[PDB]
């Protein structure tokens, strides 16, 4: 990991920015993955899958 | 180098957790849903004599 060390860990300002980006992108990726699992486990149960949606007299 | 790489992984979570808790408190002070549901209506009015002001 010394190649990555020489680029990110050398300065604490860069290391702090790396942590900020990792929290930003990492949380977005986990959020996307959780939503994919949520959709796959609940097929046909969402509000968008109501057959008579928009057809109330 | 490997240790710093591994420790940064958990630092990702700590920053996210702190950001979530702080933001959740801040947004709780924003306008509630019952408040936002009363922001659009219409009212009709009539006529008044000249030189006057009705509120």
């Amino acid at each position: 990991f010394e190649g990555f060390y020489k680029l990110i860990m050398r300065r604490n300002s860069v290391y702090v920015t790396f942590i900020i980006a990792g929290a930003f992108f990492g949380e977005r990726a986990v959020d996307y993955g959780v939503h994919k699992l949520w959709e796959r486990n609940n097929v046909g149960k969402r509000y968008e899958d109501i057959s008579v949606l928009g057809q109330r007299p | 180098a490997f240790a710093y790489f591994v420790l940064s992984g958990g630092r990702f979570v700590y920053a996210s957790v702190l950001r979530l808790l702080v933001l959740k408190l801040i947004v709780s002070m924003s306008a509630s849903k019952d408040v936002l549901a009363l922001a659009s209506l219409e009212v009709d009015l009539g006529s008044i004599e000249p030189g006057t002001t009705v509120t």
Partner: peptide, 28 residues
């Protein structure tokens, strides 16, 4: 001449954190 680089490096971190706490993607 490294204090200036320290300021620029920390300015990027401050900018990166600001876009991270407040995420104004729907405003830009």
């Amino acid at each position: 001449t490294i204090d200036i680089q320290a300021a620029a490096g920390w300015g990027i971190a401050a900018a990166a954190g600001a876009i991270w706490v407040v995420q104004p993607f729907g405003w830009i």
